[PDB]
Amino acid sequence: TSVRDIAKDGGIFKKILKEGDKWENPKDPDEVFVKYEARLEDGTVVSKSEGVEFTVKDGHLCPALAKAVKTMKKGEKVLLAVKPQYGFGEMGRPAAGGAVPPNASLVIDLELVSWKTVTEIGDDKKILKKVLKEXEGYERPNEGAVVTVKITGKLQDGTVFLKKGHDEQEPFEFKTDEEAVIEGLDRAVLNMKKGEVALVTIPPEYAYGSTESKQDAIVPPNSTVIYEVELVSFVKD
């Protein structure tokens, strides 16, 4: 059976119990959906989830999960043998939700169910585009394309402040790279395929900046905003 020293440390050994599908593994920015059960060597269950999502680079539970999933395929099911270095280290963890002793090793059953691919856009990497529905095939708006999109703009709490281009509205078309839209939407759309539906997280300097925007609700100055965007079609320049 396959067993990887994924940290190249003996720090984490991943043992494949069920092979996953395809060739793709998730990457740091992606949002993965996993289930797991994490135990001490004596079988004590310290944490468990029948399904939780996280951004790979932000981690979940302890360094070993994010390290592990970046090596896993869709549907892969594994048992991780984890040293305290990649677990809870010298501090261990107090009980509440399995206390983990200082310097304890863990044993973790982990299944990668699925994930959403997130692209970092801009020189900055500060614009995140998370694909909710893949578009069709290859080819993307270029600078000067005229694009038709449906968009909804929300604050990070869930407040919808903008809706444009939906089927019950007039169609919304813009030309890219003309400042026809906030810079984060302009750059996102150059990175999308026809039919793609994406969630775009956009910091203030690439959205409404330091002045309030009076929309369905006021976007407070300095807000990061999330656009859900569907690229309906485009005609490249």
Give start and end residues of each alpha helix (H) in the chain.
63-69, 183-189
Q: What are phi and psi of 156, to 5 degrees?
A: -65, -15
Does 197 lie in the same domain as 176?
yes
Does 160 lie in the same domain as 78?
no
Cα–Cα distance, 211 to 184 (Å, whole number): 16
Computed from CA positions of residues 140, 146, 148, 153, in that sequence, does the dihedral angle turn out positive or negative? positive
Does 101 lie in the same domain as 216?
no
Q: What is the dihedral of CA 113, 43, 48, 67, to 10 degrees?
A: -50
Does 142 lie in the same domain as 50?
no
Q: Experimental method for this entry?
A: X-ray
Which residue in the block uniquely carries the two structure tokens 């203030």? 204
Cα–Cα distance, 20 to 18 (Å, whole number): 6
Does 109 lie in the same domain as 9?
yes
Residue ending a domain, among 58, 81, 116, is: 116
User: How many domains does one find in the chain?
Assistant: 2
Does 228 lie in the same domain as 158?
yes
Residue ending a domain, among 86, 116, 146, is: 116
Spell out the long-range contacts of 61-65 with Cβ–Cβ below 8 A and sequence spacing 24 or more: 61/36, 62/38, 62/86, 62/87, 62/88, 62/106, 63/87, 64/12, 64/106, 64/108, 65/34, 65/36, 65/108, 65/110
Q: Which residues contact 15 (CB under 8 A, 6 or more apart)?
A: 1, 2, 3, 78, 79, 80, 81
Does 150 lie in the same domain as 97?
no
Does 154 lie in the same domain as 101?
no
CATH of the domain at 188: 3.10.50.40
Strands 213-214 and 77-82: unpaired
Does 97 lie in the same domain as 131?
no
Cα–Cα distance, 145 to 116 (Å, whole number): 26
Does 135 lie in the same domain as 232?
yes
Residue ending a domain, among 84, 116, 148, is: 116
Query: What's the domain range around 134?
Result: 117-237
Does 34 lie in the same domain as 138?
no
Does 82 lie in the same domain as 58?
yes
Provide the resolution (angstroms): 2.1
